[PDB]
Every structure is written in C-alpha cells, then in structure tokens.
Design a protein around this ligand. Sequence first.
Ligand SMILES: [Cl-]
Ligand SMILES: [Cl-]
Lengths: 429, 429
Amino acid sequence: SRVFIVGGHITPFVGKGSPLFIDKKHPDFGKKKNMTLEEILATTVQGTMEHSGLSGREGIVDQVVVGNFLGELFSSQGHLGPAAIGSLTYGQAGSKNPLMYKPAMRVEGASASGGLAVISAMNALKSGSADITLAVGVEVQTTASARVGGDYLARAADYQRQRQLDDFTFPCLFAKRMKYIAEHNHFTMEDTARVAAKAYANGNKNPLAHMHTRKLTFEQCNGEDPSNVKFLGNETYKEYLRMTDCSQVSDGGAGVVLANEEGLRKMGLSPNDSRLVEIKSIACAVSNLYEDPDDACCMFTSRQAAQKALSMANIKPSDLNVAEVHDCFTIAEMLMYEALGIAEYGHAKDLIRNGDTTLEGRIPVNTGGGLLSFGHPVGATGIKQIMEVYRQMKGQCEAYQMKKIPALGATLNMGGDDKTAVSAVLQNI
Amino acid sequence: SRVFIVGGHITPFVGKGSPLFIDKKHPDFGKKKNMTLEEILATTVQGTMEHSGLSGREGIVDQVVVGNFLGELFSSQGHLGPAAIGSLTYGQAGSKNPLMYKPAMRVEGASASGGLAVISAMNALKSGSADITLAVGVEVQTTASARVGGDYLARAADYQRQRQLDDFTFPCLFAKRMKYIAEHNHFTMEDTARVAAKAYANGNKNPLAHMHTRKLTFEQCNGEDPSNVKFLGNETYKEYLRMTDCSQVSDGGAGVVLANEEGLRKMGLSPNDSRLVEIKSIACAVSNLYEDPDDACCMFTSRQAAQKALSMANIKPSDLNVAEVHDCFTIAEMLMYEALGIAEYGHAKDLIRNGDTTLEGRIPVNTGGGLLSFGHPVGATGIKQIMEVYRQMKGQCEAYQMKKIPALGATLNMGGDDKTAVSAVLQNI
Ligand SMILES: [Cl-]
Ligand SMILES: [Cl-]
C-alpha cells in the first residue's frame, strides 16, 4: 500500500565536454574505452544494491524494471530485462545469481521511460506481486554523431509527421514553442538564458554532472559568445534556440529501490526510519502523439500529471520545498514551472527573474544541474529526478545541498513534446 | 483482485505469401498500400473496443499498455503510448478523444512483449490504480529485407556475444539447440517436421493466418521439397534448420480488455457472465542474457514461468484442455511441451508422434496455426495467445473450433532464446 524509497544510485553522466569521457584528446584515447550499455547497466544495478543495503540479500528483490529509450538503435540491444538479471554478476562467468528467474522487463515512453519504470514498479508493490522492487534507467547515446542522434531521438516525435522539420527534430519542436511564446510575450530568450546560467552554476557544484567543469555566464548563455551557435537548419525556427539552451547527449544510469511496508519489515526497517522518503503519490498522463494543442505556452499533459499527483497527495504547489523538472531545453524548464503550478500561467518569468528557483531560493529546482548540465541519459532521467529529491531530503548533496532540508518535493518527467508525463510527490521522513 | 478477459481482437497477420499482403504481384500494387504500424495500432485498438462492448464508452478504460519489440527500427517510431492514445480517432483531425490524458506506455521483452503488456495491465488492475485496462500488441516487420530484418531481431540476443553466429542470429540459436537435441536423441528433425505439418493444417482452417493459403505435407516439411531450403550461413548449424521450421515475418496486432470485478460492475457485467474468461494466474521468469545453460534440451526459464503459473492456479498440466505455446521454431514447440509439462523431459516426441496436440487430440496446442502458420508479428504474439484460448473457450474459432469447449487453458510466451517467459492459466466461465 504505502511506498518508500530505501536507497539508490546515480552514475556520473558522461559525454563530450566531460573529462571522464574518452575522445581523441583524452590521455587514454586508444588505451581505454567508454562504458558500453551493458557496462553502465552493470554499474547501475550494482551501485543501486550497494547503496540500498541489499548486498548479500539481493534475492529479496521481487522484480526489476528497466527504463530505456534507444538501446536498440545506439547499442543494437533490446531485451534489457535479462540484461538486468545478468548485471549483478556481470563479467563473473558462472557465478551464482540470486536474481535468476525473477520478473523483469523494459519500459519505454521516450524521455519519460525512467518515470514509467517507477510507476510500473509501484503498481507491482501495490498489487500483491512485489514487496521490494528495483527500478533502473540507463542510456548510451555517444555512439553516433549529433545529426544521427537527432534522427534517433525523433522516435519520441510523430516521426512521419515531424522528422521533416529538421534533423534535430526535438530541438526544432521546442524552438517552435519558443517562437509562439515570444509572439505572446510569455517569456523571453533572456529568461531562458537565465535558466541556463542557473543550471551550469548548479552543475559546477556537482561532480556527477556532465558539464561540471564548464563555466558559463548569463551573458554567454544569452548569446554573447560566438561558439553559442543557433544551429538549427529550419529557417522558420532557427533564431529561437541556442546551443546552451539544449540538454546534453549523455551516457549514464540511475536506480532506486522501492519497498512497501512489508518490504521494509523484511529489511528490518520501520516506516519512520529517517533514512527513508515516502512516495506519497505518482501519476501519469499521456496525450495524442498525432495532434498538437494550439497553445505552445502550456504543457497541458505535464500539467495534468502534476495536478493528479498533487491532488492525490492532498498538497498544493506552494507546499513544495524542492522540485526536479524536465529541462530538456531551457524553454521547457520555464514551461515546467507553470505545469507544476509553482508559477501561474505567464509567470514563470517572475520566478527566474527573482531567483526563486535557485539554490538559495524559496523553491529550488534542479539543484544539481538538470538535464542541461547534470546531463540527459534518456532512460536514467526519470529515476535521477526521484533520487535528486531523495538526496536533498537526506542531506547528501554536498556542495549543492540545500541549507533548509526539504519536507516536500515533486518530480515532473516528460517524454516527447509533452506527450507523456509522470509526476511524483515525495515526503521526507 | 480477480481478473477477467472481457473481449479482444486479432487482425489478419500478413507478410510475403499471404494474398492480403500487397507486393509487385498483387492486383492493387501501385493502387493501395499495406498498413503502417500506426494503422495497425488504430485497427487493433478500435477492434478491441468494439468487440469488448466498449464502443461509445471508451472513456471508462483507465489505461493502455502497448507491447512492441522493434517499432523504433522497422517503423522509426517509439513512444507508442501516445500513439495508442491517438488510435481511437486516428485520421480524424480534431475529433473528441475520450482517451486523452489517461496513463499509457510501451513495454518490451523481445517476443514476450505482448505477454509483458498483459502482466503490466494486470498489476494495474490489482493495485487500485485501474479497473479496466486495454493491453495491445502490434508489430510491422515487412518494411526491411530478410537480412536487415535478421539484424533487427538480433536485438533479442546478446548482440555483442551472438550476432557473429549468423546474419539470421535468432534462427541460428535454435539450430544450435537442435544440433545438441539430435546429439542427445531428445527428438528428431522428423518430429519437428510433424509440428510444422500440424501448424499448416491448422492454419488452412484459419482465415486470419499468414500462411492460411499454403498447404504443406509432412514430406515437404521433412525436406522433400527443393524450395524448403537450409538457409543458414553458419556451417556448424546449417543442416539443422529448414525454412518450414521457422515462424513467419508478419505484420499484425492483437488486443484484449482486462477488468477486475469493479470494472465488470462499471460495464454492467457480472463475474459469472458467459462472455468472460478468468485469468486464474500469470507468471514471469527472466534469466541471464549473457549466459546460456548447457542443456539445450530444456527451456528452464519457460519451465519456471509455467510451473509458477500452474502452481498459482492450483492445477497440473494434465488438467489443461488447450494451450498456446511459443513456436518461434518447430524446435521450440517441442521444447515448450516439456516446459509446460504436458510431456515429461524427453517425451515431447511421444505427443507429436501420437497426434495428442492436434485439433482432435486430448491437448490441442496452437489450434489456429501458431507463430509458424498464423504468423509472428512480435509484439502481438503474447496477446494473440490469450485471445486464442479465449476464442476456443467461447466457441468462436469456426473451422478450427475444438469440438469439446475447453474449461482450462495455458499460454506460454517466450522472449529471445528462453531468456524471458510469461505464462498464464485461463479458466472458462
Ligand atoms: Cl523525449
Ligand atoms: Cl525474440
């Protein structure tokens, strides 16, 4: 019935611009390779068990759900259920494996895949099938060029209808929102530069962040840097999107262990244990892939998911102390403030202008960098969000730790152009 | 907490060799096109609603789960949750849509993806979060060459480890089993020819079957036909697999509406309604993608799933009156009889030699053709299996209707080389 976060793990998120990423320019180029999807999933499953107190007793996990979007394209690998079952002892041939024969599957809803894993794992916990579940999200996207990656990520779009917009289909869909947003004075490209400045400043305090080592001023984020190019091909939307407005092409993983009251009891924990966080509610809303709303200024689907979650938890947005939102673009972060309801329609700009969502603000958002600086390994992201609220609640975030420990948090995870949304309310214990 | 099949729908399964498939050789070549994935999903969702009594009240469905393996490769399209949400009114611009904002997602575990959609839907029904769910499985595989297709289906294998075996990786993995099976006298290539003779004879009575129009004798299935080629490239395994031993590359869909007692109440039905079949149990077992058991003569994972399901429903294999099993190859059907437990280890051969699993036998299996003749649109298969037991129980199968209406049935759906398995026990009402 009730559901608890017992622990979890986030890998460093890596790609171009991280010193952890091996390219023709890294001391180990030709000597060592970046992790494969299998290696990331192994590290993520192992790390999750290690930081959840399950070492030696991994057999008490009832089910495993993997969130992943594009493994079949980037890594030529689907069927990650049995890859997850083999991840606890990966590379140790013939070893005993307590996860053998357990239920496992992959779920997918574009960049909401990790959020969907969490809900699926929660349904299992409330259904009689499971008392302890492991939800892991992983992605490897660095194995193709930027343009090829665009085409792959267009699988999140209505591909027949939208791939034609630009090779960078998904960035073009958000540039298209921005043109409409600017035409209705909803917010500006100066506002979106401010989101980016905050994300990179936050990421500079987060050693796991893809962009940890990159420092960017507001001025650079606002286009006073010749390398911050307007890179789209589509001439209708090109002027509305800069490089710094975009989430990173990252590899990484995140996992969480979730338990109901009987799972806690099996682990020797009581529901009042101060290492725990309760998932007070979770909700999913999905719209029509084939049709878009006219009002680009409103993410109606994300707004539905958040309102369902907040209502199920019996709280209002003003009760929230921290959030993680889906900043796949700076443009999206701004819309997410309004979808979540921490700003009224047309007032996200007030928040970003007054610093309310910065680390020292009254409602910090994406405290570790978001998709923009922390990075965006698609499948991992939904779970990374849950774990970031958890980490702030437990005082674990070091240089980006909030000074006032948050009592209530929310997540809002999105797939595609606001076509899938998953939202959770977390309560600190 | 109880779960009922209310109704469902299966499309014709189409591909090369069906008269319903449009190729340079069909009267409508150049005039009409085969369905796209979107069109198949539209037809399947609409048909499932229609045949389940939900037309005009589609809004009482709480959520949709889609099973699909390779859409992101064959159709450049992932994110099928929102595609499913737009499927009821697909092609009708701006129409009212009662499915808007409902939860939806895609699940995947290779050729067990449909079976996984059913389990996920059932978890929702038992957890408080749904009373009526739609589980739909769809696949389109006719959009690539055989060899490109082969590489795509290799996403079911451990791609790094196994892709090198043959361009037809997955077939080769079953040819490899057959070599070991022959070496241990477990069963013979005559036995596997007998499975195929049965599938095609059954398919000839099924107008939805991909191979409905193809008649094949035992002798042809046993290699007395020059066109029944041993097509593998790998010289170690080549001699152990004929064309007629393989499932079809098919396009199609299947859907089912599942409800709990409160769902039945909302639809105006009672749990004793003669249009219903109860799912007495369902189980999933997943093994290690990276490691294979020595004994090719046993599908351990599938055996685990079926034993779990039978045990949960409190029955034995001898109680079963009908079964649908995963005949991705003739070789697999034989192993499935032993995994399901209708034959003891080493005795599947007794069953196929005596006709026990034919339409007139005491335990008819794959009454409509199986994956071999009915066809294998990957994602649909797990749900087609459920709907075929349902159809036999309700007397709906016409020329392949069993003379004795079955009281108990079992499904066994498998992903990859026995790495994921889903098994259900159905009870006629
Ligand atoms: Cl996405
Ligand atoms: Cl498969």
